[PDB]
Design a protein around this ligand. Structure first.
Ligand SMILES: [Cu+2]
Ligand SMILES: [Cu+2]
Lengths: 125, 125
């Protein structure tokens, strides 16, 4: 499978990786500039960026999941709070403007993960 | 297939899309806020961003190709110049301190597409 990857920010490498490996994303490659965190079919490529403000962090990527209730119940049960103010933070599955439903995930760095439900997905905006 | 996607900037929608549909990435979805440009398995999600400087554009994504010679010969033959100063621009397949070889692709917006030749641990997600 020929594949297009999201390239995302990490300030310290054990600090960013331990949040994602609780959510199933295992450490398949690690050097010092680049870190690939991968849950089965879901590849996330995290580059070393210690000069980062989490408020100015323009880095989003969608997780296109065949159920959305498994991975959102996983986030609440492992230890990630549902909150308007905070980082890390999560927001619930909603209805909006195209065909089905979407939710949200933010990490310790400021990375905007958009969570969906597969075709089935159709994610009203 | 469950899949993690790169979310990328587009100023005008026919202006960004016509560059990528020359490179095989057909218009599978289009509304007004979001535009999905996809070469088979290679999904690129382009959101509407007209307040963009191309010099300050921090948006990279890797195309993981099992041959790199087809898609770099495609860029030179369809009409994309190999140049140090310019946008759109391309840079050649150079040898890398990690595995194999990586070339560059920049569009009219300022989107950094990292063109990888894949190695012996080909972990298909
Ligand atoms: Cu936002
Ligand atoms: Cu650079």
């Amino acid at each position: 499978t020929d594949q297009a990857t999201p390239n995302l920010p990490s300030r310290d490498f054990d600090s960013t990786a331990a949040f994602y490996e609780r959510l199933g994303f295992g450490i398949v490659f690690r050097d010092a500039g680049w870190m690939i965190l991968q849950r089965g079919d879901l590849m996330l490529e995290f580059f070393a960026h210690p000069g980062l403000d989490p408020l100015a962090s323009w880095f989003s990527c969608c997780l296109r999941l065949d159920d959305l209730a498994e991975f959102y119940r996983q986030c609440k049960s492992v230890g990630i709070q549902e909150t308007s103010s905070g980082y890390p933070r999560i927001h619930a599955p909603e209805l909006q403007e195209w065909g089905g439903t979407m939710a949200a995930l933010v990490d310790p760095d400021g990375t905007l993960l958009r969570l969906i439900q597969n075709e089935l997905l159709a994610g009203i905006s």
